[PDB]
C-alpha cells in the first residue's frame, strides 16, 4: 500500500490540460452569464420604479401597481419552473450537491433557460431571494453543457467541470473568488468519500468568471461598511455568546424553512395553478412591502450598510428581523427559484447589530461599536443553518474587508456551529437533498 | 443511494470528546509556539549583547558573530542526529506521513528535540522559518494528548494530529485561516477519504491563535501598510510574473533536493562530520547576519523594506542569489527548520524586482513595485510546495491588502500551471516519497 502512496505522491497535481482549458471556458461563460442575469434583474426592478413614478399621484392605485408588477413577475416566474423544470425551484444548490454525487440529473437543455428567466422574474419582482442560488445552478449546467458538448469523458472531467461551474457561479454572484473555491471544497463536494476534483482546475474557472464580473461591475462594491474598529481580547467572550445565540436559533430557522415547505405545499396541493397563483400572491406581497417598507422586502444587501453603521433604532431592528424571517420563508419555502443564502446574510447582520447595541450599553468600558458585532454575525446564520463556517467567514471577510475582526468572526461563527450541533440542527442544504433524494425512493 | 440519505442527515456530528481535546491540543501548541518564539528571540538577542561587548576589534567581532551561531547550530544538529533524525528538515513531511499512517510520531523524543533543536538553529540566525518546528511540535502535541487520554478510533487520531498541525502553523504566522486551509489543502491524505473533523480543527486553531495574541499583541509580523489597487489592463503583468515563478519553481526544487544529496557526502552519515558541517553553516549565517543581514536571517525583516521599494534594482538581485544560496545550504543540510517562510522572503524579493522593471516599461499603468512584491510573496509556496489556496490566504492574512487578491491569484495560479507543465512537483510531497521510499529499501 505504501509502495502505492510513493507512486501517487510523485504523481500528484497533474491534471489533464484538456480539463484545465475547459474549466477556463466554463468560467468565462458562467461569468458572462451571471453578469447578464444580474443586469436583467436590475433592469426589471428598475422598470417597476418607472411605473410607480407613473402613478405617484393616486396612492391606492400606486400600492396596486407595486403589487401587480411583482405579482405578474413572480407568476411568470413560478410558471416556467413548474411547467418546465421542477428542480429550478428552491435554492438550486442542493440539486448540484446531488449531481456531484451522481444522484441527481443535470437537465441543462431545460434548467439553463428556465432557472435564468425564472429568476429574473422572482428577483426582478423584488422578492426576498439571493442570486447565488440561480447562478450556482446556472453555473453547474454551464460546466455540464461544455462537458457534453465537447464530449469530454471520465469522472474527473465530469465532477470537475461540474464543480467549477458551481464555484465560479458563486464567486461572480458575490464578487469573491476565494469564497467560491472554499464553498465547493467544504460543502458542494461529495462529503463522505474520495472524489476526482482538480482544485487547480477550479481556480482557473473562478478567476475567469470573477474577471468577467469585474469587466462589467467595477467601481462599486456590493456591501461597503468601510473600516470598523478593533476588538480587544477582553471582548471576545461576547462574540462567543453571540455565537451561542445564533447557534440555538439556527436549527429552529431550519425547522421553519422546511415545515413551511410542506404547509405551503397544501395550499396548492401540487396543482400547477394553485401554485403559480400562490406565487403571484407572495410575489406581489413583496413588490408591495418594497414600497411601504423596503427593509422587509428585497434581496437584503441595501440594508446591511445602514444596520452596521447603527442608523437603525433598537426597535426598527427587531421589527425588520421578524418581518424578514417571515418574508424569507414565505419566499424560499414557496419553492421559487432563488438562493436563501444572501437573505441569511442580511439576517445575521440585523441580529448582529441588535446584539451589538445591547452590548454597547451594558459594557461602556469596552468601547464597543454595534458594527463589529454586526459583521461578526453577518455570516453566523450561514454557520448555524447551512453549517459551512469556513465558507461563511471567508465570504464575509471578502465583502466587508475588515480582517481585524477575523478572530471574533470565527469565535462567533464557531460557537454557532457548536450550538447548532448540540441542539439537533442539520446542514439545511444537505437536509434538503435528503428530503428530495428520499422522496424518490419513498415514491416506489 | 439509500446510504447517502443516511449519511447526509448524520453529517457534521463529531464526538464532543474529540472537540474538547482539539481545544486542549490548541491551547498547548499555542503556549508552546509562543515559548519557542520567545526563546529564539532571546538567543538572537544574547548574541547582539555579545557584539556590543567587542565592538572595538573588528576581526574579533566577526569571529564572535560566527562562533556563537556556529556553537548554537552544532548543539542544534547534534540533538537531532543523536535523538531524532526526523526533527531534521522542515518537519512538515513527517506529519503528512503520520496522517497517512506511514510515519511514526515519536513525541516522547521529537518534542524536546525539535524544540531545543530549533532554538539552536533559529537563535543562531540561520535561514529557516518557524512553521516547520512548530507544525511538527504541533502534531506531536496533538498525538501526546491522544495517547495520554487514550482516545481511540481513526477520527480521534487523525483529527488531533491534524489540528495539532494546523494550530501549529497558525500561531507561527498569526493567521488562523491559513492554518485550516493548509491541512485541508496539503497536510491531509491527498488521495483517499479521511476521518478528519474540520470543525474540531477550528477550535484548536482559535485556541492557539488566542494564546499567541495573549503574548504577542500590539505588533504584526509583516507590515506593508496599504498599497494601491490594480487596474484590469494591468492583470496580464501578474500572469507573466506567475509564468516566471512557474518555471523557476521546479528548478528551485531540483536544487533543494540535489543539495541534500551533495551535502550528505560531506559527512557521509557520520554524526560528527554532520554536526560540524552544521556549525560551519551555522556560523556562516551568524556572520552574514552582521556583514549583510539581508542575506542571512529568517527573512521577515526585509519584506517591508523591499515592498516599499527601498532597495536598488541591484541590491535586490544580489540578495536574491545570496539567499537562494543561504537557503539551500540551510535546508538541504538537514537542520530543523521550515523552508516555508524563507520562500516567502524570496518571492517578495523576486516580486519587487519584477515590479521595478514593470514600473518603467509601463509608465501609463502607474504601477507600484510593492503590488508585484505582494503578488509574488506567496508565488514560491505556489510553484514549490504547490499549494496556492493556502499561500494566497496566508499572505492576504499578513499583508492585509485584499484589493490585490485578483492579481495575487493570477500570479499564484500562473505559477502552479507553469510548474506542472515544466515537470516540477509538490516539494513537500516529493520529500515524503524520498523518505518513504528509502524506508522500504
Amino acid at each position: 500500500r505504501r509502495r502505492q502512496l510513493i507512486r501517487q505522491l510523485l504523481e500528484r497535481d497533474k491534471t489533464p490540460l484538456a480539463i484545465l482549458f475547459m474549466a477556463a471556458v466554463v468560467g468565462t461563460l458562467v461569468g458572462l452569464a451571471a453578469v447578464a442575469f444580474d443586469k436583467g434583474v436590475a433592469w426589471l426592478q428598475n422598470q417597476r420604479m418607472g411605473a410607480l413614478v407613473h402613478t405617484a399621484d393616486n396612492y391606492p392605485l400606486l400600492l396596486t401597481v407595486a403589487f401587480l408588477c411583482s405579482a405578474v413577475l413572480a407568476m411568470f416566474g413560478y410558471f416556467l419552473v413548474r411547467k418546465y423544470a421542477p428542480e429550478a425551484g428552491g435554492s438550486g444548490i442542493p440539486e448540484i450537491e446531488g449531481a456531484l454525487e451522481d444522484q441527481r440529473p443535470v437537465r441543462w437543455w431545460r434548467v439553463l433557460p428556465v432557472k435564468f428567466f425564472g429568476g429574473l422574474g422572482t428577483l426582478g419582482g423584488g422578492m426576498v431571494l439571493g442570486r447565488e442560488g440561480p447562478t450556482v445552478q446556472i453555473g453547474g449546467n454551464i460546466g455540464r453543457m461544455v462537458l457534453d458538448i465537447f464530449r469530454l469523458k471520465g469522472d474527473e472531467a465530469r465532477h470537475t467541470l461540474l464543480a467549477t461551474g458551481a464555484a465560479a457561479g458563486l464567486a461572480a454572484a458575490f464578487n469573491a473568488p476565494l469564497a467560491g473555491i472554499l464553498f465547493i471544497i467544504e460543502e458542494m463536494r461529495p462529503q463522505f468519500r474520495y472524489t476526482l476534483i482538480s482544485i487547480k482546475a477550479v481556480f482557473i474557472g473562478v478567476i475567469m468568471s470573477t474577471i468577467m464580473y469585474r469587466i462589467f461591475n467595477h467601481e462599486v462594491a456590493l456591501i461597503d461598511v468601510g473600516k470598523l474598529s478593533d476588538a480587544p481580547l477582553n471582548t471576545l467572550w461576547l462574540y462567543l455568546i453571540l455565537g451561542i445565540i445564533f447557534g440555538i436559533f439556527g436549527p429552529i430557522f431550519n425547522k421553519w424553512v422546511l415545515g413551511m415547505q410542506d404547509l405551503l405545499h397544501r395550499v396548492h396541493g401540487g396543482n400547477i395553478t394553485k401554485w403559480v397563483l400562490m406565487g403571484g400572491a407572495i410575489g406581489g406581497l413583496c413588490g408591495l412591502l418594497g414600497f411601504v417598507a423596503p427593509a422587509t422586502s428585497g434581496g437584503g444587501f441595501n440594508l446591511i450598510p445602514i444596520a452596521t453603521a447603527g442608523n437603525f433604532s433598537m426597535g426598527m431592528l427587531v421589527f425588520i428581523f421578524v418581518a424578514r424571517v417571515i418574508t424569507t420563508l414565505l419566499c424560499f419555502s414557496s419553492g421559487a427559484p432563488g438562493g436563501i443564502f444572501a437573505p441569511m446574510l442580511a439576517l445575521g447582520t440585523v441580529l448582529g447589530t441588535a446584539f451589538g447595541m445591547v452590548a454597547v450599553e451594558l459594557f461602556p468600558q469596552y468601547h464597543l461599536e454595534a458594527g463589529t458585532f454586526a459583521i461578526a454575525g453577518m455570516g453566523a446564520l450561514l454557520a448555524a443553518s447551512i453549517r459551512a463556517p469556513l465558507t461563511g467567514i471567508i465570504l464575509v471577510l471578502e465583502m466587508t474587508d475588515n480582517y481585524q475582526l477575523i478572530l471574533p468572526m470565527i469565535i462567533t461563527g464557531l460557537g454557532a456551529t457548536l450550538l447548532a450541533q448540540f441542539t439537533g440542527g442539520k446542514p439545511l442544504y444537505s437536509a434538503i437533498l435528503a428530503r428530495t433524494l428520499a422522496k424518490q425512493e419513498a415514491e416506489q | 443511494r439509500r446510504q447517502l440519505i443516511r449519511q447526509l442527515l448524520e453529517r457534521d456530528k463529531t464526538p464532543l470528546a474529540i472537540l474538547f481535546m482539539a481545544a486542549v491540543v490548541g491551547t498547548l501548541v499555542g503556549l508552546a509556539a509562543v515559548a519557542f518564539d520567545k526563546g529564539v528571540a532571546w538567543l538572537q538577542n544574547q548574541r547582539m549583547g555579545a557584539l556590543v561587548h567587542t565592538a572595538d576589534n573588528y576581526p574579533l567581532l566577526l569571529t564572535v558573530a560566527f562562533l556563537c551561531s556556529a556553537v548554537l547550530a552544532m548543539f542544534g544538529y547534534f540533538l537531532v542526529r543523536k535523538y531524532a533524525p526526523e526533527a531534521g528538515g522542515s518537519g512538515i513531511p513527517e506529519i503528512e506521513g503520520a496522517l497517512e499512517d506511514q510515519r511514526p510520531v515519536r513525541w516522547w523524543r521529537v518534542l524536546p528535540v525539535k524544540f531545543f533543536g530549533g532554538l539552536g538553529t533559529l537563535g543562531g540566525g540561520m535561514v529557516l522559518g518557524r512553521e516547520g518546528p512548530t507544525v511538527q511540535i504541533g502534531g506531536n502535541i496533538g498525538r501526546m494528548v491522544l495517547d495520554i487520554f487514550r482516545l481511540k478510533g481513526d477520527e480521534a487520531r487523525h483529527t488531533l494530529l491534524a489540528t495539532g498541525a494546523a494550530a501549529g502553523l497558525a500561531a507561527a504566522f498569526n493567521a488562523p485561516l491559513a492554518g485550516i486551509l493548509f491541512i485541508i489543502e496539503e497536510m491531509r491524505p491527498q488521495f483517499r477519504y479521511t476521518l478528519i473533523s474540520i470543525k474540531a480543527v477550528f477550535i484548536g486553531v482559535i485556541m492557539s491563535t488566542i494564546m499567541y495574541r495573549i503574548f504577542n499583541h500590539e505588533v504584526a509580523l509583516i507590515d506593508v501598510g496599504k498599497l494601491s489597487d490594480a487596474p484590469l489592463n494591468t492583470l496580464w503583468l501578474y500572469l507573466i510574473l506567475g509564468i516566471i515563478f512557474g518555471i523557476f519553481g521546479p528548478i528551485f526544487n531540483k536544487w533543494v533536493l540535489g543539495m541534500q544529496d551533495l551535502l550528505h557526502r560531506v559527512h557521509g552519515g557520520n554524526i560528527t562530520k554532520w554536526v560540524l558541517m552544521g556549525g560551519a553553516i551555522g556560523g556562516l549565517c551568524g556572520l552574514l547576519g552582521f556583514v549583510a543581514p539581508a542575506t542571512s536571517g529568517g527573512g521577515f525583516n526585509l519584506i517591508p523594506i523591499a515592498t516599499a521599494g527601498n532597495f536598488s534594482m541591484g541590491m535586490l538581485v544580489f540578495i536574491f542569489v545570496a539567499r537562494v544560496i543561504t537557503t539551500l545550504l540551510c535546508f538541504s543540510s538537514g537542520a530543523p527548520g521550515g523552508i516555508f517562510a524563507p520562500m516567502l522572503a524570496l518571492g517578495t524579493v523576486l516580486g519587487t524586482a519584477f515590479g521595478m522593471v514593470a514600473v518603467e516599461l509601463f509608465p501609463q499603468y502607474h504601477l507600484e513595485a510593492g503590488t508585484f512584491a505582494i503578488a509574488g510573496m506567496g508565488a514560491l509556496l505556489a510553484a514549490s510546495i504547490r499549494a496556492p489556496l493556502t499561500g494566497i490566504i496566508l499572505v492576504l492574512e499578513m499583508t492585509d491588502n485584499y484589493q490585490l487578491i485578483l492579481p495575487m491569484i493570477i500570479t499564484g495560479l500562473g505559477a502552479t500551471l507553469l510548474a506542472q507543465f515544466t515537470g516540477g512537483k509538490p516539494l513537500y510531497s516529493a520529500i515524503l516519497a524520498r523518505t518513504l521510499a528509502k524506508q522500504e529499501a
Partner: antibody, heavy 120, light 107 residues
Framework: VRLLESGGGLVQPGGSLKLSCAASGFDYSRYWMSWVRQAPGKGLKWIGEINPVSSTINYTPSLKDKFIISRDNAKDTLYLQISKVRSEDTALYYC??????????????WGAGTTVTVSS | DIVLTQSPAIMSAAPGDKVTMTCSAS?????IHWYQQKSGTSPKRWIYDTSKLTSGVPVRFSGSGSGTSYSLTINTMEAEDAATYYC?????????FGGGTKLEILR
C-alpha cells in the same frame, strides 16, 4: 505625537470656555480621546471621552450640560466646553488619547494641559 | 466608581533601596494602571495592565496585585524615581484614580 491643548484662562463665576486640544503625529481617527482634570493639591478626575465618529460621548456624573465634548476629525482637534462655572472648576485640564493592552483602557498619551481659573 | 485608595500618602527612601506603594480598590478591580507625575509635567503612563512596563520604564519597576489590592515596586529605586504615582482602573466604568503616593528621596 503631540497633544497640545490651549484655551484655558481666567473666567468669572457663571461663565463659559471652549478648551482646545490639537493633535500632531498620528492618525486622529481610529482613536478615542478624552479630557481629565486635576484641581490643585487635589487629584485627577476623568471628565469625559469621545470616539472617532463622535457617535459616543460619556461624562463623569455631572449635571445636564456642565460639559459638552466634541471633536472635529478634520482639524485633528478635540474640544471641551464648560458652562456655568464655579470654583470647583478651577483646575488644570489635560487631554489624552485612549488605548489598551488586554482591553482595560488607560490614558495612553497626555498633553501639557491648559489652566482654568474661576474667579471674580 | 470604584474608590481607589493609594497607601503611603507620602514616603521617603534612600537610593538603591526597595520600595512598594499600595492601591486598595473598594470593590473589585482588574489590571490597575500606573502613572508617574513629576512636579510640572503631565502624568506619564508607567505600568499598565497590573504588571506590564510601558515601553521605556526602567525594569526597576514591577507592577502587581489582584482583585482588591494591588501594588507597585522599585527594586532599588534611584533618585530619578522621585515623583508621585497614581493608580488607575477602568475595569468598571467609570475610570477612577487613586489618592496618589508621593515618593521623596531620603537624604
Amino acid at each position: 505625537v503631540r497633544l497640545l491643548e490651549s484655551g484655558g484662562g481666567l473666567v468669572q463665576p457663571g461663565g463659559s470656555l471652549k478648551l482646545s486640544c490639537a493633535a500632531s503625529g498620528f492618525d486622529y481617527s481610529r482613536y478615542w480621546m478624552s479630557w481629565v482634570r486635576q484641581a490643585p493639591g487635589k487629584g485627577l478626575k476623568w471628565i469625559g471621552e469621545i470616539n472617532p465618529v463622535s457617535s459616543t460621548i460619556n461624562y463623569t456624573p455631572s449635571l445636564k450640560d456642565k460639559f459638552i465634548i466634541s471633536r472635529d476629525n478634520a482639524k485633528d482637534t478635540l474640544y471641551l466646553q464648560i458652562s456655568k462655572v464655579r470654583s470647583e472648576d478651577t483646575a488644570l485640564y489635560y487631554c489624552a488619547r485612549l488605548y489598551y493592552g488586554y482591553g482595560y483602557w488607560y490614558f495612553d498619551v497626555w498633553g501639557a494641559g491648559t489652566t482654568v481659573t474661576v474667579s471674580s | 466608581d470604584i474608590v481607589l485608595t493609594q497607601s503611603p500618602a507620602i514616603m521617603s527612601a534612600a537610593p538603591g533601596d526597595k520600595v512598594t506603594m499600595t492601591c486598595s480598590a473598594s470593590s473589585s478591580v482588574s489590571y490597575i494602571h500606573w502613572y508617574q507625575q513629576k512636579s510640572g509635567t503631565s502624568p506619564k503612563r508607567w505600568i499598565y495592565d497590573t504588571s506590564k512596563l510601558t515601553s521605556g520604564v526602567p525594569v526597576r519597576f514591577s507592577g502587581s496585585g489582584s482583585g482588591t489590592s494591588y501594588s507597585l515596586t522599585i527594586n532599588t529605586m534611584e533618585a530619578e524615581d522621585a515623583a508621585t504615582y497614581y493608580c488607575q482602573q477602568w475595569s468598571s466604568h467609570p475610570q477612577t484614580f487613586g489618592g496618589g503616593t508621593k515618593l521623596e528621596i531620603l537624604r
